[PDB]
Design an enzyme around this catalytic site. Structure first.
Site: not given
Ligand SMILES: NC(=O)c1ccc[n+]([C@@H]2O[C@H](COP(=O)([O-])OP(=O)(O)OC[C@H]3O[C@@H](n4cnc5c(N)ncnc54)[C@H](OP(=O)(O)O)[C@@H]3O)[C@@H](O)[C@H]2O)c1
Ligand SMILES: Cc1cccc(Nc2ccccc2C(=O)O)c1C
Length: 310
Positions: A45, A50, A79, A112
């Site tokens: 993803d 990013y 996105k 996004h």
């Molecule tokens: N559509 C959007 O607006 C949006 C927003 C947020 C995120 N996303 C996408 O969703 C992805 C995931 O979400 P996120 O970045 O919020 O993080 P996440 O998946 O909620 O992870 C948070 C922290 O969990 C830790 N972690 C991962 N595996 C673990 C394990 N097995 N045990 C303990 N800790 C663990 C990681 O630290 P480490 O790296 O140190 O392991 C990571 O920084 C993002 O990278 C992005 O691709 C999209």
């Molecule tokens: C609520 C919102 C609106 C627009 C983009 C995002 N996403 C991000 C914002 C900051 C940093 C990372 C992200 C993400 O997409 O991983 C969100 C959570």
């Protein structure tokens, strides 16, 4: 280990999250995405936001070149950033993402966020815009028809925003998914039921409780992975709280992302397929819901199209 989308394509149910904050060297994205693929992740993803699409696209091309996977075994998502909502900007923004990754197509392209921002190359212009997202969506449809994206969807949309697209005069393609914040503290049960009723997949981000980035997340907020019910379940199954939180989603019919830039934790995360939770376990997790969205910033909350307004 795939779900069939509403346009006939397939999406792997566990995805690799690639976002890292800008203090992490851009070279890490290439290394960890390769590790994710070696581990068994097939869903990757990314996003214009990013600033890692070159690296992530290179990691995918490396693993194709060395013989580990073929392009069609990889599901790659990018996105549309919110400064490119105006319909004439959608296709050029997608083509730029494709050029950065050096790929012929994305498996999935998402809007996004529904919170439009002033057009420009600046990601956080400092200012909102008003755009008919139905016209944005029309331009996403044309990118599908062109073979630039296999599937198209939305991200961060609430029920009403999602309904707007679904009810659109002359709709050609339903969003295949809505990728939203989703974890035991903010489990989105009602939104999830709505998506199931429409054959739209809910994709959970921050499923492990978010990276807790101080720019949008209050450091006082509770740390999901220290939750006592999660910890008690991890002891019961002899797994880890992260694994319980991921498995919870798969058993709800939710596609789950997991970001990790750590070699051990990347490999650990694919263990989600190796065990299951009982009904009493799922109920215990369901009981954690407390309407907590980690991303909680004036940047979003004062937007006319803030998704959490409803
Ligand atoms: N559509 C959007 O607006 C949006 C927003 C947020 C995120 N996303 C996408 O969703 C992805 C995931 O979400 P996120 O970045 O919020 O993080 P996440 O998946 O909620 O992870 C948070 C922290 O969990 C830790 N972690 C991962 N595996 C673990 C394990 N097995 N045990 C303990 N800790 C663990 C990681 O630290 P480490 O790296 O140190 O392991 C990571 O920084 C993002 O990278 C992005 O691709 C999209
Ligand atoms: C609520 C919102 C609106 C627009 C983009 C995002 N996403 C991000 C914002 C900051 C940093 C990372 C992200 C993400 O997409 O991983 C969100 C959570």
């Amino acid at each position: 280990q795939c779900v069939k989308l509403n346009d006939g394509h397939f999406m792997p149910v566990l995805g690799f999250g690639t976002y890292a904050p800008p203090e992490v060297p851009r070279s890490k994205a290439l290394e960890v995405t390769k590790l994710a693929i070696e581990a068994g992740f097939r869903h990757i993803d990314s996003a214009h936001l990013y600033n890692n699409e070159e690296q992530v696209g290179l990691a995918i091309r490396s693993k194709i070149a060395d013989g580990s996977v073929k392009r069609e075994d990889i599901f790659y998502t990018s996105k549309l950033w919110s400064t490119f909502h105006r319909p004439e900007l959608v296709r050029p923004a997608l083509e730029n993402s494709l050029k950065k990754a050096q790929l012929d197509y994305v498996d999935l392209y998402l809007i996004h966020s529904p919170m439009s921002l002033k057009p420009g190359e600046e990601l956080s212009p400092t200012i909102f815009d008003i755009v008919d997202l139905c016209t944005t969506w029309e331009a996403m449809e044309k990118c599908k028809d062109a073979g630039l994206a296999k599937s198209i969807g939305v991200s961060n949309f609430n029920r009403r925003q999602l309904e707007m697209i679904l009810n659109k005069p002359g709709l050609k393609y339903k969003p295949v998914c809505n990728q939203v914040e989703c974890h035991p503290y903010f489990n989105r049960s009602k939104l999830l039921d709505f998506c199931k009723s429409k054959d739209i997949v809910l994709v959970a981000y921050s499923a492990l409780g978010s990276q807790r980035d101080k720019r949008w997340v209050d450091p006082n907020s509770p740390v999901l992975l220290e939750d006592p019910v999660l910890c008690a379940l991890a002891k019961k199954h002899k797994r880890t709280p992260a694994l319980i939180a991921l498995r919870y989603q798969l058993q709800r019919g939710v596609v789950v992302l997991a970001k990790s830039y750590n070699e051990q934790r990347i490999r650990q995360n694919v263990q989600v397929f190796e065990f299951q939770l009982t009904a009493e376990d799922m109920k215990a997790i369901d009981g954690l819901d407390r309407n907590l969205h980690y991303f909680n910033s004036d940047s979003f909350a004062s937007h006319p199209n803030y998704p959490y307004s409803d």
